Every structure is written in C-alpha cells, then in structure tokens.
Design a protein around this ligand. Structure first.
Ligand code: MG
Ligand code: MG
Ligand code: MG
Ligand code: ZN
Ligand code: ZN
Lengths: 1332, 145, 156
RNA sequence: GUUCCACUUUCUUAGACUGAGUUUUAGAGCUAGAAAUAGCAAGUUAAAAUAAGGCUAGUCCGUUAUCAACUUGAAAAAGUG
DNA sequence: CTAATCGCCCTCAGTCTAAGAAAGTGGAACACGGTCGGAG
DNA sequence: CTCCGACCGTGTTCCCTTTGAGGGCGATTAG
C-alpha cells in the first residue's frame, strides 16, 4: 500500500510516506491536553533536526590533564614529606606559609612573607637572588653551607618542572666543543683509512650542521663539501647518526643482517654490542666518538655557552638572558629619553599599547611587542645592535618562555645531583635520601601500565601483584608489569568473527603461515601429456614441495618452481601460474628466521614444540620491551644456548592476523576427525578451499560454526563519526513511529539516501609549506612572508605548494598573475568528481597539459618527472598523485550497507519453511546523483536558504524515484536491493566491447541510459530527437510504471504542500560549567567562586554559566519592608553546576533561592528549544532562560522558488542556447516576482518577526538598488532570507548594508503562551495552556 | 486557406477523382513545412496490390521525393481513419502528425478500434487530429457503397 | 520436398541474400498449392522505402502473379516474426496462414506485444504456425546483430 | 554486497608526557604638595589553584553517548491517538 | 528604579607508543540440471 | 537399451544503438 522515503544526514533526517500513486496521505490526528483544539489534519511528511554529535576527544584531553595535575601535586607532597622533619627544626611554619600564599593578608594565619617571615630578610633575598636561576647556580658551584629553605626551593623548582622525556639514557654534557670533536673524528678516520684521507678543507661544520634546515638537507650540504664521499659510505652513515637519522650499516660491513642504530632508542648499547661482536670491537671507540660529538651538539641551540666555565650551563644561560635584558633596557630607556621622550609615557607606562609596559604587565606577547617596537627602533639611530638582537629573537627575552620545551630532563637531573653532592657533606639526610629524590624526578609511569586504579576506574586495566599502596620507589615490585602489558594489548585486539570467543592468532604465527601456504597450494593445478584434465596436487606431492623447496629456500620464486620442480620432476619446459605474480605470495618467513636463530632444524620440525614456538612468537609479538621479552623467554634459555636467547631478544614482530587457532586447526569434523588444516594438507581428489570447507553443506563445519554466529550498543559499535550514529538512531526511531502511525503494517519498500559525508586546515597547510620549503631550500618564504589565513585562497596555496613554478612547463610563475593562470583537473571532472588539491593543478595555460580528454601526455611526464620527484621528496605532492602519474605513463558505501542491514534485520524477522529469510520489506539504497539529476532535468529546483522543506522534499523524491526504478527494472534488484545478489558479470568483462577502457565511463553511460524512461523526448548529441510513449509499462507484466500526464502534477502538488512537520529536537545542554577564562576581581554577582573559600569579590573567578534547562516555578517572595507575600510565576535557569542539587531536593533548592509556598506539582522542566505558541500563530522556541528563537517557517510558493533559482544562476546550465534564452525571456517577463517576494517577506516579518527597524532598512535598501541588474538583486534577496530563517537571529549583509541581528532579550511572553509538546514526527501534540 | 478544412477538401477532391476512376474514394496528402510533398488515392483494385492504399502511396511518394525513409516533421491529412497497417507505416515513417476525418470503429486503428501510435511498446509517438469534415466523408462513402 | 522445413530453408536462403545486400536478413515466400507464387527479402535501406519488407514484397508478387489482391488459402513463410505493419498487410491480403520461426518478444505482433492477427473484430482469421527452424533463425539473427544473450533469453 | 593476501593515505579509540597562559599573594618605590596635582627610579621572578567537588579513600572519578507527554512499572520495559 | 539595546568576548602548542576501521591500487570466490560418451 | 560417469554455461539495461556561532555581560539609553 505505502512506502517510506528517508533522507539521512548529519544534522537532519527527512521522512515522507507515499502511496501507490505517489500521493502523501493526509490524516486527522487527535490533539491531547487542556486546550480548545481536539484534532488536527497533518500531511505525512516532515524532517527531524538535531545538533551535531561530538567526538570524545576533548573529554580525553581534559581527563589526562587532570591526571597530570594530580600526579605533579603528589610529587610535591612526596618532597615535602621527605623534608618535613628537618624543616620542623629550622622553620616551624615554612610549609604552612607556603601553602597559604594565595590567601589575602587578612585571611592569612601567619605572616605575609613566605620564605623568611619578615621584610628585611625577604628584601635581602630578592636583592641577592633576583631570579631562581641565580640561586640554582650559586647552590651548584659554591661550597658554603646553605640555608635548608633555599635548598628546598631549588630542589622543588627543578622537580615541579622536570622537562621532557624524549631522549633515553644519560647525557655527557662536559664536552661542549664541536670543532675539536669534528676535527678529531676526521683525524681518527684518516688514521684508520691510510689509503684515503679526508681533508678538513676549512668546512664550517658548525654553521652547516646547526643551521635551521631539515636533517636530510643538512646531510646533503655536509657531503656536498666533501669530495668523493657518499652519504651511504661509512663517514656519511656516521654523520647521519649524529644528525638523529636512522642509517643502515649493512652495506658498509658486508653484513647480511640489518644493523640500524638510533642513539635515542634504548636498545642502542645492545645493537652496538652485536655490531662490534660481528665486526670487532676496535671500532667501538669510533662510534663512541660519534656519540660524544652528538652529545656536544645535542643541546647547542639552548645552552649557547661553553660548559668549561660552569657545571650549570642552563642556569648560566638564563643569567645571561637576564643581564642582556637589563643592559638593553637601560640602553633603550636612555635612547628614548634622548630622542623621543614624548613617547616615553606610551612605551613604559600604558599597559594597553603593547609597549614594554604591555609586554611585562599586560597581555602582550613577545611577537606583538617586537612588531610594536620595530618601527620605533628603525626610525631612530644608534640602535644598530638592537636590530641584530631582534632578528636573533634575543632582544628582551624572559626566562619562562614558550620555547623552553626543548630542555631534556637529563640536565635538570645533572644539576639536582650536583647540588645534592655539594650539600650532602653538611646535611646527612640529603645523603641518605639522595637516591629517593633522584627517583622522584626520574620515575615515569609506563604507558603500557595505565591508571593505578583499584577496581573503580572504567578506563584502567592494570593488575596488582600485591595490595600495597604504590609509590615511585616500589613500583617495579608492586605492579605486575608483564600482565599489565598483556592486558594493554589484549583489550584492544580483534576477536575472530567466526568464533567470537577466540583470540586472533599473531600474523607471523607459524601455524598461520602454514595455513596460508597450503591454502595457496591447494588450488594449484597441473596437466601432463597422459592425463585428460588438469589435476590438483595430492598430499604426498604437497609434502614433497614443502619439505624440499619451502623448507630449504627462504623465498620461493616462480622461476625456482618451474626449473627446480616442474623441469626436474615433471620435465615441463614452460608452465603458467595464475594467482601470484613472479613469486609465491605466501612464504614461511618465520620458519627460516627461527632456523637462522636456533640453528637447530630438528627442534623446529618437532611437532611437540609447536605450541612452545607459537608461545615464543606470541611473546615476540606481545612485547617490545627487550627487558620484558627477555624475562618472558628466560625459561627456555636452557634448551640450546645463551647466544640463541640473545639473538631471539632482538627479533621483533608486529601485526595480528584474521583467524583463530581453533578455526584453522581446532575444529574436527565428527565423521572425519580431521581439522581444516588436515583437509588443506590432504583431501584426496578434490583439493577443497577454505571457503569451500566453510560453505560445504555435506560437511558439518558450517553448521557447527553457525552456533555462535541491543540497538544502541549495536549502533555505537559501528565505525564512523558520532554525528552519523546520532542520525542513525533518530531515523530508526522515526521509522518505528511511522510504522506505529500506519497501524503496524510494514512498508513495501524503504528507499534510503545519504548525504555526502566526506566534506564533514590552515595549520596543516602552513606546516606542509614550511616543511616542503625548508627541505627544498627555497627562500620564497623569506622573500614573500605568508600567514595561514592567506593560504585559504586556492591559487595562492597551489602557488606555494609548487615553489612558485609551473607544473607542466618547468618555468617560474608570478604571484601577481594568478588571475591569468588556470586550475586544471588532472583526471577530468566529467569522469571523477574530485574537487580536492589531489586532482587539481595550477598551470599558466591548460594547453601545455597535452590532450584535453585525458591525463597529461607522455611528453609532459618525460619533461617533468624529475621535478615531480623533487616535489615528492619535499612532501609537496603526495604518493597517490605520483602513483597515478606513473601508471598513467604505463597505461554505495560501507556505512549505508550497515544501515540497510540494521533496517533489514529489524523489519524481516520471520523464516519460511526452508529456514530462509522472508524479505517482506525491500531496502533500496540510492546515491544523491539520481535525485539531483531528476531535479535538474524536471526543474524541481532546490534553494536551501528559503526554508527547511527541502529536507523532506528530498526524501519524497527519493522514495518516488526508488519505487519507480525497482518497478521498471526488477532484475536490477541485485544492484539496488540489499541481500540476495548475483554471482556473475566477471566473465562478461573477459570479452571485447565498444568502450570499456574505464569503469567510471561504464558507470556514467549505465546510469545515463537506465534513467531515460522518465523523459518524454531525448536529444542525442547528433541533433537527433527520440520519442517515447505517454504511458510507461513493464513489458513482462504490463503493469503501468509511469504516467507522464498525471504523475508530474502529483509531484508538484506534493512539493507545494504548505504544512510540513519540521520538529527541532529538544536537548538538555551538557558539558563545561562555563567559560574557562579566569577574570580579575570585580564587584558583581556574576563572578562565581573558583574555590569554596575564595570569595570572587576578593579573588575573581568564573563567569557566564550555561543553563542546563529552565524550570517553571510558581511561589511567593517577600516584597517591601513589611515582607508582603506577592504571587510570582517565572522561569528560573538551573545551571549545569546546580543541576544535581536541584534534582536531589527541588523544594529545598527553591526555598534557599528565596521562594516560599512553592507549588511542587506545578514545576515544569523546560529543556532548550521548548516550543511555545502565541496568538496569530506566532511561535517562539526556548533558546535559554532569557532569550528566545524564531519558531516559524516561511512557506514560499514554488513558482517564486524556481524563479529565484533560475535568476540567481545565470553563468550555468550549459547546452543549447535556445533554452537559456527562453529562461532569460522568462526572467524579463516575470521580473515582478522580485517585488512580490519582498512583499511576502514583509507581510511575514510584520506578522511574526516584529522588528520594524530591520524591515524598514530592508525596504529602503531595496528601494535604492532596484536599478541594479536582476542577478545581483536576486542573490541579495536570497541573502534577505536569514532575517526570516528558523532559529537564532543572525546578522546579514544586503547590498553592502550590514543588518545586525535583532535578539529577543526577554521571556515574558512565553510565560503566558501555549506549550506545545511534540513527538519525534510532530504528528502527536500535547498543548498546555499556561494559564495558572 | 491552408487549414485542416483545406487539406480535407483537397483529399476529398482526390477521392472524387479516384471514384471517377472507378476506385475506392480514399485520399491522402502528405505536407511538410506548408509544402505538398505527397499525394495518393486508394487504388488497390486498379493495381492488384493489397498494400496500394492512399496513405501508403503518399508515404512512398514522400520518401522518394525526400530520398529518405524518415519523414520527421511531416503532416499527413486523410479523409478516413488509418487502419493498423497505415498506422504502422506512419510510425515507421516517423511523421509528425496525422489528421483524419470520419471515425471507423471497425477498421480505424487511431483510437476508434485500438491505439497504435501512442502504444507503450512503441519507440515513437505521433500526434492525432480528428473531427474535420466527417459528415461529408461519411456521405461520400455511403454514396459509393 | 515441399515440407515446412523446405520452405523455411528457402526463406533462410532469401534472408541470406538480403544479408549479402547488407540489409536486415528477413525473407518471405508466398506459396499456394505446393507451387511458388511469390518471394521477397527486405530491401528498405538500399531502395529507400520503410515498407520494403520481405513480407510486403512477397505479398505484392503473389498479388501480381495471381492478378488478385485476395490470396485465399495461401501460406506465407517468414523466418523472423512479422511486425505490426506486416501483420496488418497479411490481414488485408486475406491469406490462409503465416508460418514464422524464432519469436521476438520485444516487438512481436502475434501475441507478445499485442494480438492483431486473431483480433476479435477482424473479418478474417489467419492461422499462425510458430517455431519452424527457430534455432537456425535465431542463430542467423544473433550472428547478424553480434549481440548475445538475446536469442537464448527469447528461446527460454 | 560478503570474503582471503599485499601497498599507500586518512580517521577513530585508549595511555604516558612536556612547555606556556590566567587569577591572588611576596618583590619596604622616592621627591614637593594635607588634597587634587606633578616630576624621578626600578619592570625579567617565586608560591598556590587550574573545571565547584564525590566516596568507593584510589598517586581513582567528574565536559563522550542517551533523553516530547501521560499511564503501568526500582533500573529495564510495555501501552495510550 | 525598572527594562531594552550595542558592542565585545570566548585556553593553547607540541612528543611518543598501541590497536582498529575505511578510501584508492592490485591477485583469487559466493553453483547445478540435465547431457553427451561408453557398457554387458 | 537403460545404467554410470565427467562436463558446461547463463545469467544488468540490449533485438540496429549513442557515444565558526550564539549566549553572557558591562555600559548606555529610555520610560
Ligand atoms: Mg582538584
Ligand atoms: Mg611568571
Ligand atoms: Mg551532550
Ligand atoms: Zn489502410
Ligand atoms: Zn515488417
């Protein structure tokens, strides 16, 4: 009888119900409540709207930051607990004064000076040590006994900001010299290779190696200064090692095994040990020197000072910064006094200017301050050095800056240990507790352990070896690191879908590779002269090939198959292989790896050690911490030798397969008693496939599997954006309510369409360009500085991505001639609807691309290949573009299928007598192009800004087109309907055709052909007309599928229906309590205390909280000096922070708020977007407790919508000029439509919007611009619609006139309106007359 | 002048001439762009040919003059509703419109007895015009038979 | 000799002659009393006449040889199935029977798309014989079109 | 569409971290002028908090998802036109 | 002493490890009812 | 001459083609 059309989007779900004749039923629905109306007629079409679903990212970030804060606090607490006893003797209340430093003096328990407790000592301290780094350096270098409070201050400052943990091991920073070390390296190298010495040659290694270029570029420059020295050579590899790259050393030492060294990797010492054992340890000092040189240069950017003078290069560099700041400030002050004293007040006093006062005391950044004083500086003379300092970014630098993240923790550890050694001679407890403090700074919870929970954390997985409290000192003993890593990995790995309770095997499992090799061999056929048909291989032959070829050669090539097997055993001079290309895809890599490590083939071949070996490979896969891999393998160290274990440690695998051990070799057929692997090894005459085994009705595997094989959980488990999952839930609920509306009869067809979800980057662009240019070595950034927001222009972004060069012609481009250049589609847009940069190119003229109908010609490839190579190495073009260029030189979607499956499983729940699904409802999935083309062809134009009706209209047209398509060509059901499919069309592509060079062209032609039955006359591209009958019927049955004389009229009636159920989903606001900004102290009741005792009038705090939902309160409040009981009815906003308190006891909350005699039964919860109707039909939605939104939809007649669409789009709709001219004459004939549309808008606004000023400004502005061309006027009339649009009022520009939004700053009228409670479809309403 | 009645009376004159020739008074005139391209009269008996109708002769003369089997944008006037064979020939000729006079529920395949031009199985649609001088054609047929 | 297969084979010979002339290979022969009365093949394109079908040619030749537009009791053999035009001409000729080979159920005028020969309002009923040498007829047509899956679908 | 293997690019989820930013407090401002009014000298740092808080008392959790109205129903769930 | 308007405002940057899915390239499936070739 | 046994293609349209936002908030305006 009826079908349902659905349009599923990220912010909208359109729905419609149509009948056999494409009519939408109109039904009378009962209206509940205490109101006048008892019923309303409604059309069965509408659309649900809802705000986008958000990802869990921000919550994760917040949570991790919280954990960081608490752990830092615990660090400080540890320190104080260590210092407590010895501090109590020196100062009774030091820590107390420290912890109460935030309190105002009136609130303080002790005196206001934290460190010493009086003015004189505090001023003395600050006079002797202006910064903390002064105290640090004095405490490291001096030898005098120091005050315990200063020592504590230093240690705490180093512990509170420990620095990063990106470099492993320890550093030797005594060696600070780069020239002497490089000269020493060159020296020892020339010693070790007497035959060929390198010349020092006056290569300024410091500048080239410390320049701000990429590692690779610096390498290239380094070896460009060296004659006859290659980057792959020994010295080149050493330079690469010192630069932080990963070089391979195998080609230099004739080593068959890979020897890759990374100074940062914790395994460096062991890898180097193995390398030196292989090649001899007389080269160890050589690599040591390289390491020493790397050490001397690791921190050259930060320390900038020779490590000879002091043992605290960091604190010394800070003291340096301080002194230079001081001197240059004195100098600058003197200069401004002498030459521009009129601006002195502006520079050093006004906090709002970005001067020095704004820099130190205001919120001005170093960049803004520099830009501020650049002109002042350059306009003056005598500042020749100040500019030098400015370009170095070293003019007036502070010590706590954004760029201090480079500092590794090893240096703070060094200073800590130095201070500890210095002061352990005088305080015994520092000596006895030195190791504890060092372990406090050093220790870091491993990522594979996670939160140190005790059974109350949803996110934690760690297991406790004992029930102690965990500290940094007992962590290794209390936490079971091994089982914790095991859980860390096993909680994320996929289970086998066929056996959901079984874990998936490791990808490099020996069993898995046996399964794959046998699964490939099983389908290999052979024929000889005698036999009459090609035959499978038997068990014996397979065991022969494996034992003889697979177990002797690491890889087995096709040539080895032919010559060593086919030739030697079957005397075949030539043979064809079909499933693999030039080599067997499967291989026994682990078998040969192990054979090489254990050196005992008979150990590997013994079946009883298979599990053990699998467990070893499991361990090798499960862990990557060598110390833990070793601990796991320690049990088997006795079977062959210590060396085999040492070698087994280094072997590491990553990745997991697809199937479980029980699937491959666990299940046994009851009759046969043979596992899958047994049938793969030997199955006699039929060498049955794994797919066949799994699908063979004669065998019992399939049924034995079919044993093991919530809506919200099921939807949440899908992969995709949460927004679309929200839409999926909403559309399911809509479908349910629609079925309920239709008397629980199921629809005949459900046609679903889904909007393009790929569309739903300045920083990324700036990064891309910065890196590509730094690698390329171009100055164009220095010559033409850009900013991220400039890169939003496509032509400019392209220009910068190609280093200001032509992509086809090998010539420079002009940053001033982009308007003359062309953006060409690499693969023409007609074939691939790709609008991204991956398929777009900037060239001065598209003629230099070569042919127009294809990829750029072979000449352009030949001429530009090397340039494209350079762009690839510079990351200026991606891999996809390159690979497409290369092959070009050598010649619906998953989410919608998931939706269709969910719908089909919910709708068809019955099985026939043959235990097969009865498909009562056919789920059809269509792409957007069908309805888009249908609209363009038959002029069912769409303008999104007029109203939200198009969401429903699209669903209606989807249903219509889908039902028509399946009605006309039922054989295409396999393509368009979910479920039953057709295993064919693969052999059809093995025959010659008319044009099958591309699948895209085939799809194009296909869809352009199938949809012709909708048209009455076709115009081929020969000047040829083709006629079609008036009635379209299906040949085999004769049933009428289409009637050109009446179906269009019905469609037009449906599109023109004024009333459409557009329902905005009411949602309680969740998330952050308020804005995060911490405002200064202010006398205002809006300021919310940041802590219980922190009165915001004294301390400031938070502001502007978000209302979770309003609540209607009717009660009484005191009024006047005599406290008369007045009666009040008002809306009180319950903030998100107040929510829980209001729910726990609303009566107490309202009584505390000042309400009395609160009528509890009249409390109405009013979430956001609550709908209220007011007389004349004017409606308002609840935007907040103190603001409302527009609640009406302007139903513009379809004639005006189509006219507006055609008038706004002039430079489009290509083809024959005759139709374009007829549309031009239609515009000129119907120009009065503009005036009629503005009249309609004015009526609507005066009846509903009620903003006289904005309407008068619209009318005026339109009056002045009536002379201007119709196109412009039409576009700006389209702009005019945001005044009448649904939801929050917004500003808009009409003919350069900006109209600020008119907000609704009061909620009084809503308090006397009628509340409309709406169902999800809006068909059921409960209206409440709020008269009480 | 040049209206439906003009061509109807011209075909009636052709039918009267054919009747003077002792043949069936049925005529057909094929005009394209206000230019007469074909004229014919039913002389099946005078030629011993069952397919020698007025419509067939007119279509053949039009195809011979135009040197093409396609007669796009042609208009065929006839004093008698076309039969099934004549309707099929009009479909194959791809003519623009056919204007017939007196209806024939027994032999006219242009709506009276059946529909041929606008059948859902056809690959071409032809326009139909009726009701031009049906009484005179019926009287002439009754006088002849 | 003079059997149905013999005449269908002759019609196939004429359709092959039409194939030689690069025309749609359709042939027709009109027989009365085991005597040759008329033969024809499609010559539309080469003679610029949309009605120059095999059936039309055979009927006109029979009419000329017999000097009579009425072909009472005659049998018209045609390889392909006649179109609406040819079916109407057969009705107008008053022939006794039409024998065709392979069907074509996308334009057929003998029941598939519509029934015209045996229409209730006709003044003469023409008999229909189907499927003579259907396999050779359909193979000839498939070899001419060079587009498979049509003949097999029609036969099945 | 489902599914077995290889390559690349993107996204999602969870964990360990770092550097900043903001808010109060300590950095004895000086010289005439009772007062407004004005001149002169310094300015780089440090402590605490970083969602109010919660009990389960953990070196744990607190911004994701879900939610018209009524009725029967601890939760879940069902019915109402 | 109340409310309605007009502008102004809104925490951010980076590193590493692990797993999974999901697009573009490639290699291979997801069967059976007769039906023609020989036999004692 | 029925009984035993290895084998193979036809299935989509197609029967002369069309190629960033929106709610909070202080200062101003207004009765
Ligand atoms: Mg806290
Ligand atoms: Mg600071
Ligand atoms: Mg939420
Ligand atoms: Zn006729
Ligand atoms: Zn014909």
């Amino acid at each position: 009888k009826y079908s349902i059309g659905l349009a599923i989007g990220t912010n909208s779900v359109g729905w419609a119900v149509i009948t056999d004749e494409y009519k939408v039923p109109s039904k009378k629905f009962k209206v509940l409540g205490n109101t006048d109306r008892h019923s309303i007629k409604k059309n069965l079409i509408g659309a649900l709207l809802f705000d986008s679903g958000e990802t869990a990212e921000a919550t994760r970030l917040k949570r991790t930051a919280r954990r960081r804060y608490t752990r830092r606090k615990n660090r400080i607490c540890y320190l104080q607990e260590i210092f407590s006893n010895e501090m109590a003797k020196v100062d009774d209340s030091f820590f107390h004064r420290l912890e109460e430093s935030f309190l105002v003096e009136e609130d303080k328990k002790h005196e206001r000076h934290p460190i010493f407790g009086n003015i004189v000592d505090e001023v003395a301290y600050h006079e002797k040590y202006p910064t903390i780094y002064h105290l640090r350096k004095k405490l490291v270098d001096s030898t005098d006994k120091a005050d315990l409070r200063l020592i504590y201050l230093a240690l705490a400052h180093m512990i509170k900001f420990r620095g990063h943990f990106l470099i492993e091991g320890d550093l030797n920073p005594d060696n600070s010299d780069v020239d002497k070390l490089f000269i020493q390296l060159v020296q020892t190298y020339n010693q070790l290779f007497e035959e060929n010495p390198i010349n020092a040659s006056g290569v300024d290694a410091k500048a080239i190696l410390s320049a701000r270029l990429s590692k690779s570029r610096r390498l290239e420059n380094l070896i460009a200064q060296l004659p006859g020295e290659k980057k792959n050579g020994l010295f080149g590899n050493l330079i690469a090692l010192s630069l932080g790259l990963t070089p391979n050393f195998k080609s230099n030492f004739d080593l068959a095994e890979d020897a890759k060294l990374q100074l940062s990797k914790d395994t460096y010492d062991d890898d180097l040990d193995n390398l030196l054992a292989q090649i001899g340890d007389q080269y160890a000092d050589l690599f040591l020197a390289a390491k020493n040189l790397s050490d001397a240069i690791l921190l050259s950017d930060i320390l900038r000072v020779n490590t000879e003078i002091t043992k605290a290069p960091l604190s010394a560099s800070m003291i340096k910064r301080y002194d230079e700041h001081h001197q240059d400030l004195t100098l600058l002050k003197a200069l401004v006094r002498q030459q521009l004293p009129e601006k002195y007040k502006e520079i050093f006093f006004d906090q709002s200017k970005n001067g020095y006062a704004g820099y130190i005391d205001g919120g001005a950044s170093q960049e803004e301050f520099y830009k501020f004083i650049k002109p002042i500086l350059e306009k003056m003379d005598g500042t020749e050095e100040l500019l030098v300092k400015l370009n170095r970014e070293d003019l007036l630098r502070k010590q706590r800056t954004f760029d201090n993240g480079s500092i590794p923790h090893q240096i703070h550890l060094g200073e800590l240990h130095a201070i500890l050694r210095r002061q352990e001679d005088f305080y015994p407890f520092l000596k006895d507790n030195r190791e504890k403090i060092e372990k406090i700074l050093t220790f870091r919870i491993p990522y594979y352990v996670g939160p140190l929970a005790r059974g109350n954390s949803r996110f934690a997985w760690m297991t406790r070896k004992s029930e102690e409290t965990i500290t940094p000192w007992n962590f290794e003993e209390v936490v079971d690191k091994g089982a914790s890593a095991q859980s860390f990995i096993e909680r994320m790995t996929n289970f086998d879908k066929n056996l959901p309770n079984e874990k998936v095997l490791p990808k490099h499992s020996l069993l898995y590779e046996y399964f794959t090799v046998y699964n490939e061999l099983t389908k290999v056929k052979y024929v000889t002269e005698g036999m009459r048909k090609p035959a499978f291989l038997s068990g014996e032959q397979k065991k022969a090939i494996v034992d003889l070829l697979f177990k002797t050669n690491r890889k087995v090539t096709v040539k080895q198959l032919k010559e060593d097997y086919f030739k030697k055993i079957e005397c075949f001079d030539s043979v064809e292989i079909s499933g693999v290309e030039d080599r067997f895809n499967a291989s026994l890599g682990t078998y040969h790896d192990l054979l090489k490590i254990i050196k005992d083939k008979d150990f590997l071949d013994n079946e009883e050690n298979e599990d053990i070996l699998e467990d070893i490979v499991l361990t090798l896969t499960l862990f990557e911490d060598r110390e833990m891999i070793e601990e796991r393998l320690k049990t088997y160290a006795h079977l062959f030798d210590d060396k085999v274990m040492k070698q087994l440690k280094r072997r590491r695998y990553t990745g997991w397969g697809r199937l479980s051990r029980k699937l491959i070799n666990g299940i046994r057929d009851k009759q046969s008693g043979k596992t899958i692997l047994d049938f793969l090894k030997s199955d006699g005459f039929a060498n049955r496939n794994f797919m066949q085994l799994i699908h063979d009705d004669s065998l019992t595997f399939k049924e034995d599997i079919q044993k093991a094989q919530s809506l919200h959980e099921h939807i949440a488990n899908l992969a995709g954006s949460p927004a679309i999952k929200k839409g999926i839930l909403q559309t399911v609920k809509v479908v349910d309510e629609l079925v309920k509306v239709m008397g629980r009869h199921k629809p005949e067809n459900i046609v679903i369409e889904m909007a393009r979800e790929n569309q739903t980057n300045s920083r990324e662009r700036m990064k891309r360009i910065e890196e590509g240019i730094k690698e390329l070595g171009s100055q164009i950034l220095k010559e033409h500085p850009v900013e991220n927001t400039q890169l939003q222009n496509e032509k400019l972004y392209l220009y910068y991505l190609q280093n200001g060069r032509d992509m086809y012609v090998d010539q420079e481009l002009d940053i001033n001639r982009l308007s003359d250049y062309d953006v060409d589609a690499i693969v023409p847009q007609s074939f691939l609807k790709d609008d991204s940069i991956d398929n777009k190119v900037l060239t001065r003229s598209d003629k230099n691309r070569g042919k127009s109908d294809n990829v750029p010609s072979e000449e352009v490839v030949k001429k530009m290949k090397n340039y494209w190579r350079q762009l690839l190495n510079a990351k200026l073009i991606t891999q996809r573009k390159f690979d497409n260029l290369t092959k070009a030189e050598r010649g619906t979607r998953q989410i919608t299928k998931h939706v269709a499956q969910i719908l089909d499983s919910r709708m068809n729940t019955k099985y026939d007598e043959n235990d097969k699904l009865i498909r009562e409802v056919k789920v059809i999935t269509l792409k957007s192009k069908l309805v888009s083309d249908f609209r363009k062809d038959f002029q069912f134009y769409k303008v999104r800004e007029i109203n939200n009706y198009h969401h429903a209209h699209d669903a209606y047209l989807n249903a219509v087109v889908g039902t028509a398509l399946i009605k006309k060509y039922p054989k295409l059901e396999s393509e368009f309907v979910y479920g039953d499919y057709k295993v064919y069309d693969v052999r059809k592509m093995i025959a010659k055709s008319e044009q099958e060079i591309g699948k895209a062209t085939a799809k194009y032609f296909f869809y352009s052909n199938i949809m012709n039955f909708f048209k009455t006359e076709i115009t081929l591209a020969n000047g040829e007309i083709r006629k079609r009958p008036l009635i379209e019927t299906n040949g085999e049955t004769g049933e009428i599928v289409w009637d050109k004389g009446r179906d269009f009229a019905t469609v037009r009636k449906v599109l023109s229906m004024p009333q459409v159920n557009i329902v905005k989903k009411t949602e309680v606001q969740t998330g952050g309590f308020s804005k995060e900004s911490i405002l200064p102290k202010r006398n205002s009741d809006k300021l919310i205390a940041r802590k219980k005792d922190w009165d915001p009038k004294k301390y400031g705090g938070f502001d502007s909280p978000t209302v979770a939902y309003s609540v209607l309160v009717v009660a009484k409040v005191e009024k006047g000096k005599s406290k008369k009981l007045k009666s009040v009815k008002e809306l009180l906003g319950i903030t998100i922070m107040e929510r829980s308190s209001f729910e726990k006891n609303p009566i107490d909350f309202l009584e505390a708020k000042g309400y009395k005699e609160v009528k509890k039964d009249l409390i109405i919860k009013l979430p956001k977007y609550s709908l209220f109707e007011l007389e004349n039909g004017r409606k308002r939605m609840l935007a907040s407790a103190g603001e409302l939104q527009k609640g009406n939809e302007l139903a513009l007649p379809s004639k005006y919508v189509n006219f507006l669409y055609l008038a706004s789009h002039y430079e489009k709709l290509k083809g024959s000029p005759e139709d374009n001219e007829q549309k031009q004459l239609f515009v000129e004939q119907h120009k009065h439509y503009l005036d009629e549309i503005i009249e309609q808008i004015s009526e609507f606004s005066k009846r509903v919007i009620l903003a006289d000023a904005n309407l008068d400004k619209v009318l005026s502005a339109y009056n002045k611009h009536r002379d201007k061309p119709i196109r412009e006027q039409a576009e700006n009339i389209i702009h005019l619609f945001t005044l009448t649009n649904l939801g929050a009022p917004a500003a808009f520009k009409y003919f350069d006139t900006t109209i600020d939004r008119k907000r609704y700053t009061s909620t009084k009228e809503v308090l006397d309106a009628t509340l409309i409670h709406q169902s999800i479809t809006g068909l059921y309403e409960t209206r409440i007359d709020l008269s009480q | 002048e040049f209206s439906h009645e003009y061509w109807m009376r011209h075909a009636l004159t052709l039918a009267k001439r054919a009747r003077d020739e002792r043949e069936v008074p049925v005529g057909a005139v094929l005009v394209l762009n206000n230019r007469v391209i074909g004229e014919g009269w039913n002389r099946a008996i005078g030629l011993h040919d069952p397919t020698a109708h007025a419509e067939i002769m007119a279509l053949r003369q039009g195809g011979l003059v135009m040197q093409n089997y396609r007669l796009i944008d042609a208009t065929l006037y006839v004093t008698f509703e076309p039969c099934v064979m004549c309707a099929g020939a009009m479909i194959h000729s791809r003519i623009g419109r056919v204007v017939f006079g007196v209806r024939n529920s027994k032999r006219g395949a242009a709506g009276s007895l059946m529909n041929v031009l606008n059948y859902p199985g056809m690959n071409h649609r032809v326009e139909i015009t009726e009701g031009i001088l049906a009484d005179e054609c019926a009287a002439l047929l009754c006088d002849f038979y």
